[PDB]
Write a protein that binds this ligand. Structure first.
Ligand code: CDL
Ligand code: CDL
Ligand code: CDL
Ligand code: PC7
Ligand code: 3PH
Ligand code: 3PH
Ligand code: HEM
Ligand code: HEM
Ligand code: UQ5
Ligand code: ZN
Lengths: 70, 50, 59, 48, 55, 108, 441, 50, 122, 464
């Protein structure tokens, strides 16, 4: 394994001197909002392109069925 | 979005508008895979570390 | 003692792209000769018993 | 950084490219696969 | 960090999500992703109206 | 070490127990293990399915129906093998899209 | 097909003597010297050889080192002719290898020399490469860091010979000041070396009045006219620690030395500046040559000695003439006694045949040093740097015009001066130091 | 470099030391399985034809 | 097209500055510099240029990389007092890497390959 | 761009015309005595020193199995006293002329020469003729040298490269005269005497096989007079016992073979691979010189090995495959040797072997013009460097009259070098290297050196 020159001091605490699932209920709305802020633009771009092109195609398909309609 | 649109179009019937949209989607798929990934990536490297 | 010729070496042996087509034509002719010898021996031994012998006999 | 990155940086010169003799020796493998396919299939006197 | 301690339970969580989706698909909507025409025996002389593959 | 004396235990230890992995991998790095689990599930369900399927015309449809209604747990096995292909493709597609997003195929 | 005419046969009509024979010069060429407007002195001598040698002599060496920049001359020997402001290392290496030229960096005890040897058709290329590699050198961090390893094995290999170590300790004991510093230092001296240390040493040693351009087989007017824009140097003369002879004695402890080495030395008064004293010192060096290998496989047997190796160094203002003799570990006192007996018998008089033989040996060494173009260029450069002129004809005249009375007087004046005494090896047998330096008194 | 400091051989006139100091040009191979051709036999080998 | 190219040079500078500002604002939340994004495993020119650096710079780079990876594992950012000191556009690798790339360009015009290979771990 | 520091010089290899260097090069004068001995001088106009000596077309090749080692023992004996001068008389007289005597004994060539000053030409001629013609060859000195040679044989006191090259000559030239070592076996030294030395000198040291070559400060007519006075009494040669008749009678034979000399606790791994090369008179010997320059050589005390023009030097220096290596081109009267010798250890021996074989076979297919122009310029510059030292001038005069039969002029040599191009290099490499047998020799820690089939497989490429 490689040799990485590094100067630090690392502290770790035991898993049994800590809570397991009690900060999830506190950090849950902040995590939700941070996720949507970080990935908001791409999800919006994907949704707008997909649903707009699908709606345009479906509208034109209905128009073409009505154009041949007796 | 382009790939998901191609997935939606495959379950429809052959229609002139669906043919046109599928042709445009295939053209954009090739455009992204062969033009965007090298050239835009090179521009990003020139912007970041140039 | 016995030794391959230099002029025959420089033509059919020095490059693999010349050696391989020569190998394939030699393989074709070797298969043809083996087929001919086996078929001639079989037809000579079993003469008068095959179906074609009866058909040519009925002409 | 193997591929288009090599040609964007200027690492593919007239030098470091294969010579004409190298391309001819590689290009001589085109007849080998043709002869091998014709040996495998044997479409005799099929040329029009 | 070591794989076998830290990324075993992390893979187990995602495997349990996948098992939930799999169990829903098997037991509640078994024919949702399919095609109803594949429940007809094959007839080489009659073709269906729409011939589409799996999704 | 006990794993240092049998070569099977050494390889298994090196590649499944002590293998160094980045500590900041998120949940979009679980695509590969899910794809392997789906491959193993498909292999198991299919090997079980092939004990009741007959690969002949005029028997294939009836053998699938006999599998569905008469083999104990046969309907579960068939529906699992059918929907497992869909889930296998979902997982592998998300894996490929992860690799497309991060440039995971680059050197080396 | 290529040529098929065999080399016992002459080549055909496409083999022409189209260049005619140029007439020889009337006299032997003389050394012509001048100075640039920047202050760099340029001296050159024309030759009929087809090889032109260009060497650049800079005052420095171990005499210009400090405790901080210790061992910088040995590092400069390896780190020279690398990346400059105008060329990379790759470009300079390819430009040297294209014309078949060779480069060296050589560090003395009072100077560093850089040189390029090429043919007479590529003298402009050699001059430009040498000037660019000396003046505009960069001394990058990574190149010096990677060269330090090879420096360490070159010093470790050069210290394997006991004569090098004896020479170092003898120069330490004989002089105080610049000439007493160590040239071949221990490998661990340069363990903390960086490119800043080398740049500091180079900035100290470089000055226009301390740089001499010497050339062999180059026209002088052309060389000055084309080296004026290249050797326009600036800088300040870092102070030189002038050395003085004091003498003394020392020791070396070597754990696995199969032999035992004893050095004896005296001061040559006047240094390289005095022609006659240097000539007399060279004659004394030849007179101390006991076993000179003039024939193959000849076995001259001494009672006590295993090897005899005299020397005569002539620095600026002072010198060091002496002899180093080996011997068995149990016979070191006998080695000392035999060396004292040899110097005393030299002081008792030389007898005609020995004087003629030593004069011929000194003349042969002097003429064989300048036989080739790089040797002649190095001799011209060192003599101009140390004195201001090249006087090989005067040195030969001084060697030939030496009488036995003058040599006897020279050795008599030498033995009155306090000597320098150095031992070496796993020393388990030695006479006491007070009686060591008594036999010449 | 010297062979005594690099190869570090044993001292003596052993069979290996004799060939190390002066190898012989009359090398004898084993001929129970294959008989050698005369030395210096030129030409491209007949085994390619076989 | 050279006249339109001359107009496109301040446009190139404007897009370069805007991209660098946005990415550096994204970079400074992890304490990273621009030069920390370059990977020796990805690029052999970076692997050679990183070998030419003094060891304290490599130690500082490795510390910044470990700090950013710890922050990514924690899903956190730097504190505001620490975030105000970040300078993501300070160059430590650019001149070294530029000289390495110029050397590789100069060797390729004469037919020589690069004197360093890719990094192999097997 | 610097204006004065960037003109005149660029790294692009271009052919150089060395024609103006020929205007001032001196001329060689040759005079043949009625004895058959040639006297050849080359006067350098302002030289102060002189190299002069006697070159003989003889050596270890022309011995027999019974007296193998006599020519090498002769240079131990010949300087130990003559019939007119003692040991001390010779020592004093050589010391007074300020020079040194020296001797070399090859497989096919022998020289005894003196490097003196210009005033001691006649004294050096007289001394050289005195050792050559009127030697004592005393039995006490023979016994005094036999024991020293036997001690250095028992100790295995030899250079590693000489050990490898002697093994290489022994296995490449099996059952021919060129496979013998110059030193000879232990038994011939243990049973040597004065009679064999007398018979060898009487048989081989004759008029048509001897050249008196002098360079530096020397007059041709005076050396002719001195040689006729001194060396005029050498016997002539029978037509039936000439050098050509001996070459025809016992010819050289090349055998593709393999040898290694394994040691149990060695550190280095020296190895040489050679192909059958060209004789001295083959016109393909000039392209082999150019190819040897193209392969070059390198040792690890240099630090610019990664910027080398040679691709083999670049590969070995960059990957650290060897501590030192060199390409050699050995030429004999009727055969030759061409290859690469190197020093490595046991963990890098196979990769060094692969680099040697891959760079040798590559010259048959791809050779670029820049490398050929560079190697031609380097070889011509190397030839001009030998003109600077009078010792090399005298050595080349002696060698060229012995083995070519004539003094090749410098204009002809430059023209023959300049006629080499990339097609010639490809043709010569195809003739000598491609799909040919080679000779492999190694010594030291050689347990990981590949066997002969590995080396034989890599003399050709299956991809073209
Ligand atoms: C839709 C809801 C998600 C919206 C975002 C959110 O709440 O953030 C996730 C949030 C963790 O937020 P965080 O503290 O910033 O953790 C970031 C880590 O990436 C989160 O840690 P991790 O990704 O490394 O994996 C641990 C993760 C494992 O949990 C998950 O992977 C999420 C699924 C939790 C179930 C919620 C049900 C809703 C969706 C089904 O969190 C838990 O352990 C959840 C608590 C266990 C529930 C009680 C067990 C008995 O986990 C929760 O679901 C919150 C707990 C409330 C439970 C809801 C019932
Ligand atoms: C209701 C649905 C909304 C859920 C609420 C979300 C808010 C909280 C999100 C969060 O941080 O949860 C913590 C955490 C999610 O981990 P994370 O550190 O945010 O990284 C995953 C993100 O996709 C981070 O993904 P990334 O940073 O690698 O972004 C690249 C990704 C972009 O990913 C996305 O934007 C989402 C995928 C859209 C398709 O690009 C792709 O579309 C590639 C496909 C990868 C599939 C991702 C799953 O929640 C869990 O513990 C969920 C456990 C999931 C286990 C099953 C996995 C396979 C089935
Ligand atoms: C017969 C036709 C073969 C042919 O066209 O060869 C051209 C091609 C060029 O060879 P070459 O330049 O004349 O000589 C090899 C070099 O000297 C370079 O040789 P090298 O010293 O670097 O070592 C390469 C070595 C080792 O090559 C490897 O890396 C291993 C090759 C593994 C192939 C064996 C797998 C057997 C089936 C298991 C699946 O290859 C061999 O042992 C010879 C070819 C192996 C077959 O030879 C191959 O590498 C054969 C390709 C494999 C298909 C058979
Ligand atoms: C294509 C398959 C290999 C053809 C044979 C071949 O290449 O021969 C091998 C060796 O042959 C083999 O190992 C293959 C033998 C089996 C052949 C099977 C061919 C299958 C053909 C199927 C149809 C396509 C190497 O010899 P060459 O370079 O071609 O001949 C010159 C050699 N030398 C320069 C040293 C004189
Ligand atoms: C849902 C959106 C798609 C849709 O409507 O499909 C119709 C289809 C059903 O069509 P219907 O029968 O007309 O309702 O929907 C699905 O079942 C598809 C669901 C998965 C969406 C596809 C995503 C993965 C495939 C794309 C990646 C492949 C390339 C990777 C490189
Ligand atoms: C600059 C121009 C290039 C010169 C430098 C690069 C060079 O010389 O190359 C050496 C170069 C490394 O040298 P360096 O970059 O100088 O360190 O090596 C490579 O080219 C490695 C390339 C890795 C990718 C191999 C691609 C294989 C394609 C076929 C794969 C077949 C499928 C396998 C799996 C199937 C499933 C079983
Ligand atoms: C049955 C199919 C597959 C299995 C079992 C599988 C398995 C894995 C596993 C276990 C990993 C390591 C963990 C992870 O990153 O998810 C991985 C990584 C990877 N896989 Fe897959 N994989 C499959 C299909 C694919 C496909 C179809 C592609 C691309 C077209 C692909 C490309 C990659 C790449 C590039 C990585 C490295 C990702 C990174 O480290 O950034 N794999 N694979
Ligand atoms: C050793 C491994 C496998 C075996 C023995 C196997 C066996 C079978 C058998 C016997 C059938 C016909 C019975 C039926 O359709 O219910 C079947 C169908 C099928 N197999 Fe598997 N399979 C294997 C793996 C896979 C994999 C890896 C995939 C997908 C990548 C797959 C996809 C399918 C699909 C989509 C069907 C059609 C199911 C349906 O619509 O009813 N199989 N397989
Ligand atoms: C980026 O970090 C990484 C991950 O991300 C956190 C990973 O996920 C993985 C890989 C994960 C593995 C190997 C575990 C997932 C399981 C797989 C691929 C196979 C599934 C098999 C199962 C469930 C059992 C199969 C049982 C049997 C009996 C079949 C064997 C057959 C016989 C013995 C005859 C790796 C290497 C990794 O580096
Ligand atoms: Zn000998």
């Amino acid at each position: 394994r490689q040799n990485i020159p590094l100067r630090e001091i690392l502290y770790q605490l035991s898993p049994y001197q800590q809570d397991v699932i009690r900060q999830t209920f506190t950090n849950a709305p902040k995590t939700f909002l941070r996720f949507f802020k970080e990935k908001g633009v791409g999800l919006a771009t994907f949704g707008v392109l997909f649903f707009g092109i699908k709606g345009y195609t479906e509208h034109e398909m209905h128009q073409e069925r009505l154009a041949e309609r007796y | 979005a382009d790939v998901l649109l191609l997935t939606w179009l495959g379950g429809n019937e052959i229609t002139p508008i669906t043919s046109f949209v599928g042709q445009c989607c295939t053209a954009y798929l090739f455009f992204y895979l062969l033009v965007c990934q090298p050239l835009v990536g090179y521009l990003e490297t020139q912007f970041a570390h140039g | 003692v016995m030794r391959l010729s230099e002029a025959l070496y420089q033509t059919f042996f020095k490059r693999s792209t010349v050696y391989i087509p020569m190998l394939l034509v030699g393989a074709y002719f070797s298969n043809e000769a083996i087929d001919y010898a086996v078929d001639k021996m079989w037809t000579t031994r079993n003469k008068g018993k095959l179906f074609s012998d009866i058909i040519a006999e009925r002409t | 950084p193997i591929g288009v990155w090599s040609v964007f940086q200027g690492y593919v010169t007239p030098a470091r490219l294969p010579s004409i003799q190298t391309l001819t020796r590689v290009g001589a493998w085109g007849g080998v696969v043709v002869v091998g396919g014709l040996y495998m299939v044997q479409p005799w006197d099929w040329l029009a | 960090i070591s794989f076998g301690s830290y990324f075993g339970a992390k893979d187990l969580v995602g495997a349990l999500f996948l098992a939930l989706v799999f169990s829903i698909l098997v037991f509640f909507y078994p024919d949702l992703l399919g095609h109803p025409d594949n429940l007809i025996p094959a007839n080489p002389y009659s073709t269906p109206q729409h011939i589409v593959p799996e999704w | 070490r006990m794993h240092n004396k049998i070569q099977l235990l050494s390889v298994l230890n090196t590649h499944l127990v002590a293998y160094p992995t980045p500590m900041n991998l998120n949940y979009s790095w679980n695509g590969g293990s899910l794809a392997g689990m789906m491959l193993a599930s498909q292999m198991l369900t299919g090997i079980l399915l092939a004990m009741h399927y007959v690969g002949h015309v005029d028997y294939a449809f009836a053998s699938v129906q006999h599998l569905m209604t008469d083999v104990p747990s046969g309907m579960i096995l068939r529906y699992a093998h059918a929907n497992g292909a869909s889930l296998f493709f979902i997982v592998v597609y998300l894996h490929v899209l992860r690799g497309m997003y991060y440039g995971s195929g680059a050197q080396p | 097909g290529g040529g098929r005419v065999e080399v016992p046969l002459s080549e055909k009509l496409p083999a022409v003597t189209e260049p005619p024979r140029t007439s020889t010069p009337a006299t032997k060429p003389i050394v012509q010297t001048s100075s640039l407007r920047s202050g760099v002195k340029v001296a050159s001598i024309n030759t009929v050889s087809p090889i032109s040698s260009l060497v650049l002599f800079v005052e420095g060496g171990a005499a210009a080192e400090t405790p901080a920049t210790a061992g910088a001359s040995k590092v400069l020997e390896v780190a020279a002719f690398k990346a400059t402001a105008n060329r990379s290392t790759f470009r300079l290496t390819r430009e040297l290898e294209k014309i078949g030229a060779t480069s060296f960096a050589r560090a003395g005890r009072d100077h560093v020399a850089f040189g390029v040897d090429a043919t007479r058709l590529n003298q402009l290329e050699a001059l430009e490469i040498l000037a660019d590699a000396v003046v505009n050198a960069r001394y990058t961090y990574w190149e010096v860091r990677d060269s330090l390893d090879a420096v360490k094995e070159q010093l470790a290999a050069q210290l394997r010979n006991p004569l090098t170590a004896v020479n170092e300790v003898l120069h330490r004991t004989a002089f105080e000041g610049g000439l007493g510093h160590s040239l071949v230092v221990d490998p661990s001296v340069v363990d903390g070396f960086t490119n800043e240390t080398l740049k500091e040493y180079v900035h100290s040693i470089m000055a226009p009045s301390r740089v001499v351009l010497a050339a062999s087989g180059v026209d002088h007017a052309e060389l000055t006219a084309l080296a004026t824009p290249l050797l326009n140097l600036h800088g300040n003369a870092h102070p030189a620690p002038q050395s003085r002879y004091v003498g003394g004695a020392m020791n070396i402890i070597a754990p696995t030395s199969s032999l035992t080495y004893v050095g004896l030395a005296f001061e040559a008064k006047g240094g390289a500046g005095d022609i006659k004293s240097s000539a007399a010192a060279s004659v004394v060096k030849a007179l101390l040559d006991e076993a000179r290998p003039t024939m193959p496989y000849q076995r001259k047997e001494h009672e006590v000695f295993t090897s005899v190796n005299p020397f005569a160094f002539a620095y600026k203002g002072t010198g060091l003439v002496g002899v180093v003799a080996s011997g068995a570990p149990g016979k070191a006192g006998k080695v000392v006694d035999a060396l004292t007996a040899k110097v005393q018998s030299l002081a008792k008089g030389v007898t005609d045949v020995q004087l003629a033989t030593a004069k011929n040996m000194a003349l042969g060494e002097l003429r064989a040093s300048v036989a080739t173009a790089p040797g002649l260029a190095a001799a011209v450069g060192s003599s101009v740097l140390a004195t201001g002129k090249f006087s090989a004809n005067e040195v030969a005249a001084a060697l030939s015009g030496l009488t036995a009375a003058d040599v006897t007087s020279y050795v008599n004046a030498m033995i009155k001066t306090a000597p320098t005494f150095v031992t070496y090896g796993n020393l388990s047998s030695l006479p006491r130091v007070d009686s060591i330096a008594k036999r010449f008194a | 470099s010297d062979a005594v400091e690099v190869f570090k051989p044993e001292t003596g006139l052993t069979p290996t030391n004799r060939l190390s100091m002066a190898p012989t040009p009359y090398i004898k191979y084993d001929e129970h399985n294959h008989k050698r051709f005369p030395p210096g036999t030129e030409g491209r080998p007949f085994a390619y034809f076989v | 097209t050279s006249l339109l190219k001359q107009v496109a040079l301040p446009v190139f500078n404007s897009l370069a500055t805007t991209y660098r500002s946005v990415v550096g604002a994204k970079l400074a939340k992890y304490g990273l510099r621009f030069d920390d994004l370059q990977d020796p495993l990805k690029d052999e020119d970076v692997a050679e240029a990183l070998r030419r650096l003094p060891p304290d710079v490599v130690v500082a780079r490795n510390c910044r990389l470990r700090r950013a990876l710890d922050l990514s594992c924690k899903h956190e950012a730097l504190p505001k007092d620490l975030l105000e000191k970040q300078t993501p556009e300070l160059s430590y690798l650019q001149d070294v890497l530029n000289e390495v790339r110029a050397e590789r360009r100069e060797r390729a015009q004469l037919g020589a390959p690069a004197p360093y290979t890719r990094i192999y771990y097997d | 761009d610097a204006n004065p520091f960037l003109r005149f010089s660029n790294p692009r290899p271009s052919p150089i015309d060395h024609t103006p260097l020929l205007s001032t090069l001196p001329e060689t004068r040759i005079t043949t005595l009625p004895n058959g001995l040639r006297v050849a001088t080359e006067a350098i106009p302002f030289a102060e020193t002189t190299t002069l000596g006697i070159w003989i077309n003889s050596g270890s090749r022309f011995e027999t199995d019974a007296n193998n080692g006599v020519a090498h023992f002769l240079e131990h004996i010949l300087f130990k006293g003559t019939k007119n001068r003692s040991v001390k008389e010779l020592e004093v007289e050589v010391e007074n002329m300020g020079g040194q005597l020296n001797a070399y004994t090859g497989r096919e060539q022998t020289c005894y020469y003196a490097k003196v000053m210009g005033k001691d030409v006649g004294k050096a001629v007289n001394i050289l003729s005195d050792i050559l013609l009127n030697s004592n060859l005393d039995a006490r000195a023979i016994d005094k040298e036999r024991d020293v040679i036997l001690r250095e044989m028992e100790e295995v006191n030899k250079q590693t490269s000489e050990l490898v090259f002697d093994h290489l000559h022994a296995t490449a030239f099996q059952y021919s005269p060129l496979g013998r070592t110059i030193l000879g076996p232990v038994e011939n030294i243990k049973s040597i005497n004065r009679d064999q030395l007398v018979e060898y000198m009487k048989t081989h040291y004759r008029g048509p096989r001897m050249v008196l070559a002098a360079a530096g400060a020397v007059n041709h007519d005076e050396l002719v007079k001195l040689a006729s006075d001194a060396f005029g009494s050498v016997p002539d040669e029978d037509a039936a016992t000439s050098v050509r008749s001996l070459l025809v009678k016992e010819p050289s034979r090349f055998t593709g073979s393999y040898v290694h000399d394994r040691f149990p606790d060695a550190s280095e791994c020296c190895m040489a691979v050679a192909f059958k090369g060209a004789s001295w008179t083959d016109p393909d010997s000039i392209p082999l010189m150019v190819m040897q320059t193209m392969l070059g050589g390198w040792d690890k005390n240099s630090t610019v090995g990664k910027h080398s023009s040679s691709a083999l030097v670049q590969t070995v220096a960059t990957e650290g495959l060897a501590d030192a290596f060199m390409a050699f081109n050995t030429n004999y009267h009727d055969t030759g040797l061409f290859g690469v010798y190197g020093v490595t250890d046991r963990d890098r021996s196979e990769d060094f072997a692969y680099a040697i074989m891959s760079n040798l076979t590559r010259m048959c297919f791809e050779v670029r013009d820049a490398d050929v122009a560079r190697a031609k310029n380097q070889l011509k510059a190397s030839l001009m460097f030998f003109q600077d030292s009078t010792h090399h001038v005298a050595e080349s005069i002696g060698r060229e009259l012995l083995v070519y039969g004539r003094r090749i002029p410098k204009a002809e040599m430059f023209a023959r070098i300049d006629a080499v191009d990339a097609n010639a290099i490809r043709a010569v490499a195809d003739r000598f290297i491609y799909d040919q047998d080679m000779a492999v020799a190694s010594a030291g820690d050689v347990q990981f050196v590949p066997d002969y089939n590995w080396f034989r497989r890599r003399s050709y490429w299956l991809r073209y």
